[PDB]
Design a protein around this ligand. Structure first.
Ligand SMILES: O=C(O)CCc1c[nH]c2ccccc12
Ligand SMILES: O=C(O)CCc1c[nH]c2ccccc12
Lengths: 97, 97
């Protein structure tokens, strides 16, 4: 329960950092290179899962990512609220015909 | 080469999250994009930063109070030392005051 408040304090700190144009150095302080790389790759995974055109072998090759992480992210995406999903489709699939 | 593509992919995440905050979708986005263990780590890292800036606890004392390992605290202290002065001063204002 207190872990939850601690998480929310991070969320609020980062909100305020974006407001003050300090988000880039804050994220450089708070995340390791491997975590930042994972987040960048997760964006690409979410995009391709929302697109829904690739097979599992194709996802692995296109994304340079492992099946275990793709599988878990797909469940997180399934569980996401439609308010978020529709916004992500708008953003991450913005070029798709 | 790898590295420059990774940086662009990172910036894409930074923009996505910026826009999620603007649309009040940051919490569901971060629930999608991070695991429970990663969120817990970030909450703990805020406390580590806070206590390093406060400068009252020893690092081993910080270990017990935060349930954290020495390796994590030592690494965090280096990231904090490397951070730009503008960020450090803002953190002191928003976390400690
Ligand atoms: O590797 C894992 O345990 C899942 C990491 C993860 C969190 N959100 C995601 C979104 C898309 C792809 C993967 C993830
Ligand atoms: O090694 C870890 O567990 C995380 C390293 C790390 C990066 N930025 C941090 C900020 C505060 C505390 C720890 C860290």
């Amino acid at each position: 329960e207190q872990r939850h408040q601690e998480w929310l304090r991070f969320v609020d700190l980062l909100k305020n950092a974006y407001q003050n144009d300090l988000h880039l150095p804050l994220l450089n302080l708070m995340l390791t290179p491997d975590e930042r790389e994972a987040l960048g790759t997760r964006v690409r995974i979410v995009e391709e899962l929302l697109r829904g055109e690739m097979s599992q072998r194709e996802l692995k090759n296109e994304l340079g990512a492992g099946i275990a992480t793709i599988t878990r992210g797909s469940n997180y995406l399934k569980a996401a609220p439609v308010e978020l999903r529709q916004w992500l489709e708008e953003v991450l699939l913005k070029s798709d015909l």
